[PDB]
Amino acid sequence: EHTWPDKGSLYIATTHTQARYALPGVIKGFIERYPRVSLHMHQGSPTQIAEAVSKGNADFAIATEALHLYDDLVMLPCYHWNRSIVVTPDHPLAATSSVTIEALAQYPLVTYTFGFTGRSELDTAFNRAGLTPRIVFTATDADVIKTYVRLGLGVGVIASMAVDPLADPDLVRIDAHDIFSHSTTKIGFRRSTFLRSYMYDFIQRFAPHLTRDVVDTAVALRSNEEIEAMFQDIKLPEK
Amino acid sequence: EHTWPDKGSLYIATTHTQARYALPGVIKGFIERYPRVSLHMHQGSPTQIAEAVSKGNADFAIATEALHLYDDLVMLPCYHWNRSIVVTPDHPLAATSSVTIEALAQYPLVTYTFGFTGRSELDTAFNRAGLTPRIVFTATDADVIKTYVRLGLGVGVIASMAVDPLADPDLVRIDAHDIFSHSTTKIGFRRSTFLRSYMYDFIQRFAPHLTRDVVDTAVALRSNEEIEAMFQDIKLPEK
């Protein structure tokens, strides 16, 4: 009754973070809406996702910049996100009134894999603070990070969207927005890709401010930098 | 009282599957046992894990062959594992008395990422059966695979060790051991790595049949093939 007969395919390339926490609700709304649209989703590295859209068979890249690198893709900012610190309750950090980055760097760290899903913002942060991060555990998944934090491997740094006190009781969470710069999740595709109505639809559903009018305009800019500044006077979604 | 004062480091490179399901209990037993041993664990692709041990800073590669590719690593078989089919209960497969591969290939598939964690055994299987797999979703993580299966993207093929009816109620599981050949998880390191007592200890704890005597012998074989046939007359662990 309220579905579309639109026929086609939607091939998306994304990371674990998006597919796990950002995507499922959207995809559910989409697949129900567009039954004759075959949906594909393939997890890979920022470099692999790039390839898949730049050279391969993917329609859309959904990743935190970079990327969707470069460059030679139309990039549209979707939302901002940052990190939380996860530890065990008898950890020293859990008992420190306000946690600085210096107090954090005294400890072994459990976090995302190199380059990354917001790791380079972490390393940049440590460099800027004249500090050396003791990285003990790297993984793509926030689920494994929690496990190893739970058994005492170290301090966990993950996306805040990957934290749930009802799904993760007993791990203490520490908001670290004033420790790390935020990350921007973006969406993109080749300039030659014909934008179907279900494509705009998916886009707007993932990023509301990305209406068909601003999407076509952004395409016409021929610059992902000018697309970014397009939204500098509004507040992007935060997750 | 029952711990060791042994000082050193254990740098391991593995996949999501091992770190999530095979590793945590072992690591927990290890870290408690060897407090002055700094433990590292880094998730990556079979090729990245190889590099890390062949050229990088990793001590041990823990991965399903390949690898731990090649070759130029000492490879020791740890255990055998196979796949299960996960679907929703009103799925046609869930209602088919005994599921063949042909009946499986009629459906969109949700599984591991290319090359892989037992995916090439899947593709080989389909090739052998003169069938074309409709791969819709690839991921490193069995957790995301379940989610997308749950919302109806397709049929899930995962490691059986990643299935738990108490942790995953309402997804029906289909044992597919007679559909796919099993996979062998292996462990390895450079010939030049000095084997510490905590290293043998970790090894034997991950693979009981890998005692210090069979480990040193395997090292002396100068062939990972001859190491494999060493255990052809015993039954390796199955998970």
CA angle A8, A73, A181 (to 5 degrees): 115
Taking alpha carbons only, the member of B134, B158, B137 closest to residue B148 is: B137
Taking alpha carbons only, the member of B43, B16, B237, B42 closest to residue B117 is: B16
Q: 3-class secondary structure for chain B? A: CCCCCCCEEEEEEECHHHHHHHCHHHHHHHHHHCCCEEEEEEECCHHHHHHHHHCCCCCEEEEECCCCCCCCCEEEEEEEECEEEEECCCCCHHHCCCCCHHHHCCCEEEEECCCCCCCHHHHHHHHHCCCCCEEEEEECCHHHHHHHHHCCCCEEEEEHHHCCCCCCCCCEEEECCCCCCCEEEEEEECCCCCCCHHHHHHHHHHCCCCCHHHHHHHHHHCCHHHHHHCCCCCCCCEC
A54 vs A69: CA distance, rounded Å: 9
How many CB atoms lie under 10 A from the CB of residue B166? 5
Taking alpha carbons only, the member of B83, B69, B84 closest to residue B186 is: B69
- Look-up: residue for tokens 């739970």? A150
Taking alpha carbons only, the member of A157, A184, A192 closest to residue A173 is: A157
A149 vs A90: CA distance, rounded Å: 12
Q: How far is A182 from chain B (nearest CA, A)?
A: 24
B201 vs B131: CA distance, rounded Å: 44
Contacts of A40 in chain B (CB under 8 A): 136-137
Taking alpha carbons only, the member of A50, A37, A43 closest to residue A190 is: A50
Taking alpha carbons only, the member of A28, A61, A20 closest to residue A161 is: A20
A60 vs A41: CA distance, rounded Å: 10
A27 vs B153: CA distance, rounded Å: 9
How many CB atoms lie under 10 A from the CB of residue A2? 5
A158 touches B: beta carbon within 8 Å: no
- Look-up: residue for tokens 């051991």? B177
First to last CA, chain A: 33
B35 vs B29: CA distance, rounded Å: 11
Contacts of A44 in chain B (CB under 8 A): 113
- Longest pairwise C-alpha distance within chain B: 60
**Residues in contact with A112: Cβ distance below 8 Å, sequence separation at least 6, in sequence order:** A118, A119, A122, A138, A139, A140, A145, A157, A158
The residue of chain A with its CA nearest to that of B39 is: A136
**Which technique?**
X-ray
Taking alpha carbons only, the member of A215, A192, A193 closest to residue A203 is: A215
Contact assessment for residue A77 and residue A229, using Cβ atoms and an 8 Å cutoff = no
Contact assessment for residue B152 and residue B163, using Cβ atoms and an 8 Å cutoff = no
Q: Encoding tokens for residue A211? A: 């209406």
**Residues in contact with B173: Cβ distance below 8 Å, sequence separation at least 6, in sequence order:** B84, B85, B86, B160, B163, B165
Q: 3-class secondary structure for chain A? A: CCCCCCCEEEEEEECHHHHHHHCHHHHHHHHHHCCCEEEEEEECCHHHHHHHHHCCCCCEEEEECCCCCCCCCEEEEEEEECEEEEECCCCCHHHCCCCCHHHHCCCEEEEECCCCCCCHHHHHHHHHCCCCCEEEEEECCHHHHHHHHHCCCCEEEEEHHHCCCCCCCCCEEEECCCCCCCEEEEEEECCCCCCCHHHHHHHHHHCCCCCHHHHHHHHHHCCHHHHHHCCCCCCCCEC
Taking alpha carbons only, the member of B158, B140, B227 closest to residue B187 is: B227
B48 touches A: beta carbon within 8 Å: no
Instruction: Label residues B97-130 b or e (16+ Cβ within 10 Å = b).
Output: eebebeebbebbbbbbbeebbbbebbeebbeeee
Residue type at B228 in one-letter notation = E
Contact assessment for residue B30 and residue B206, using Cβ atoms and an 8 Å cutoff = no
Respond yes or no on whether the N-terminal peptide bond of residue A67 is cis (omega within 30° of 0): yes
How many CB atoms lie under 10 A from the CB of residue A23? 21
Is the four-CA dihedral B30, B32, B33, B37 of positive or negative sign?
positive
Contact assessment for residue A133 and residue A122, using Cβ atoms and an 8 Å cutoff = yes
Distances (CA, A) of B31 to A148, A152, B162: 11, 8, 24
Instruction: Label residues A152-183 b or e (16+ Cβ within 10 Å = b).
Output: ebbbbbbbbbbbeeeebeebbbbebeebbbeb
Residues paired with residue B76 on neighbouring β-strands, in sequence order? B187
Q: Do domains B1-81+183-239 and B82-182 have the same CATH topology?
A: yes
A213 vs A229: CA distance, rounded Å: 16
Counting every residue written for chain A, the total comes to 239
Respond yes or no on whether the N-terminal peptide bond of residue B68 is cis (omega within 30° of 0): yes
Taking alpha carbons only, the member of A75, A85, A86 closest to residue A185 is: A75
Q: Which fold has domain A1-81+183-239?
A: D-Maltodextrin-Binding Protein; domain 2 (3.40.190)
A16 vs A84: CA distance, rounded Å: 17
Q: How far is A42 from chain B (nearest CA, A)?
A: 5
First to last CA, chain B: 33
- Look-up: residue for tokens 């399901």? B21
Of A41, A147, A148, the CB nearest to B137: A41
Is the four-CA dihedral B7, B11, B14, B19 of positive or negative sign?
positive
* Extents of the domains making up chain A: 1-81+183-239, 82-182
A144 vs B229: CA distance, rounded Å: 34
Of A27, A108, A151, the CB nearest to B151: A27
**Residues in contact with B142: Cβ distance below 8 Å, sequence separation at least 6, in sequence order:** B17, B20, B158, B159, B162, B163
Q: Architecture of A82-182 per CATH?
A: 3-Layer(aba) Sandwich (3.40)
Assign residue B68 a region (left: φ > 0; alpha: ψ between -120 and 50; beta: otherwise).
Answer: left
Q: Encoding tokens for residue A184? A: 């921007």
Taking alpha carbons only, the member of A185, A183, A182 closest to residue A210 is: A185
Q: How far is B17 from chain A (nearest CA, A)?
A: 10
